[PDB]
Ligand binder design. Structure first.
Ligand SMILES: [Zn+2]
Length: 323
């Protein structure tokens, strides 16, 4: 009876030195991400809409052009909603599908439904078009390094459909894609042929990005079982800052502060957290002032803050994977 599902408890990062940190800082391009990964997602894309289809095609195409050996799966399912039965499609992109362990980055790609109001359309720029584009830019920026994985540990990206309530949040109207995928992963043996371990036991850590892109985000350390990984984010931010590798950034206004949040925030990590998966929840508190308004748009995004977080996240992922 293997103790492999316990490895995540002892897993340590392989920390990058200054030279490698400068390399990662220089290897990501906020302007390329903006043009190639972000702008095509700044469209209406509530579940089942033509925009959902276009967003999903864009996400798959951007991953498909990369050199690393990504395996794309579309997880399509039905769920009851306030509007009756509807179809939803999660996007899962995985390196080394049979690898026992994966570090998982995720966000939601649907946008909240709103009827057009005075000709304005809701595009959820921070919620969560930016997180989607950050995951795509990370895949692009680290592509040569990720190609090398082609420690039975690899990387997986999940873009959830249906995170948003069709009305106002309720237990039955929200988290459609995550409630479904968590249940499916919980009931899927992993690695293939296993007798008693599931894909959820294989999830070393779920790093869920949400509501990113506004100025001065502050991310609290929500959970004690991922606190040491939150501390690594703080360390990475501090070192990139001291190396002069962040833009318009100060330690007094740092993003990862020493501070917990005891309350519960409803998001896509919930169905995973309640099945025992460790979560690093990269959602700011308080939420962007533009949250769920037509002003959550491109104009209100803070370019250098997103650039800075791309660097921190990319360093975190390489250190976790020992790349
Ligand atoms: Zn939202």
């Amino acid at each position: 009876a293997s103790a492999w599902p316990e490895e995540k408890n002892y897993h340590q990062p392989a920390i990058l030195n200054s030279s490698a940190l400068r390399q990662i800082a220089e290897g990501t391009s906020i302007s390329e991400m903006w043009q190639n990964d972000l702008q095509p997602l700044l469209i209406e894309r509530y579940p089942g809409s033509p925009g959902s289809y276009a967003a999903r095609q864009h996400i798959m195409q951007r991953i498909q052009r990369l050199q690393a050996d990504w395996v794309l799966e579309i997880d399509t399912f039905l769920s009851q909603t306030p509007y009756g039965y509807r179809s939803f499609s999660n996007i899962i992109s995985t390196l080394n599908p049979t690898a026992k362990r994966h570090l998982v980055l995720a966000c939601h790609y649907d946008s909240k439904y709103f009827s057009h109001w005075n000709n304005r359309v809701f595009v959820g720029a921070t919620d969560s078009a930016v997180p989607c584009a950050m995951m795509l830019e990370l895949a692009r920026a680290l592509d040569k390094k990720l190609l090398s994985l082609k420690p039975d540990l690899s990387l997986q990206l999940i873009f959830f459909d249906g995170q948003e309530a069709f009305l106002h949040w309720s237990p039955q109207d929200s988290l459609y894609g995550s409630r479904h995928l968590a249940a499916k992963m919980a009931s899927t043996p992993h690695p293939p042929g296993a007798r008693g371990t599931s894909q959820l036991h294989g999830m070393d850590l779920l790093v869920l990005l949400d509501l990113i892109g506004a100025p001065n985000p502050t991310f609290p350390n929500f959970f004690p079982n991922s606190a040491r990984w939150f501390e690594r984010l703080q360390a990475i931010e501090h070192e990139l800052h001291e190396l002069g590798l962040l833009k318009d950034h100060s330690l007094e206004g740092r993003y990862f502060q020493n501070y917990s949040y005891g309350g519960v925030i409803q998001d896509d990590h919930i169905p995973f957290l309640r099945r025992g998966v460790p979560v690093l929840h990269l959602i700011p508190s308080p939420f962007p002032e533009v949250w769920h308004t037509m002003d959550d748009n491109e104009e209100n995004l803070d370019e250098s803050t997103i650039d800075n977080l791309n660097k921190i996240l990319q360093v975190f992922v390489l250190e976790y994977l020992h790349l």
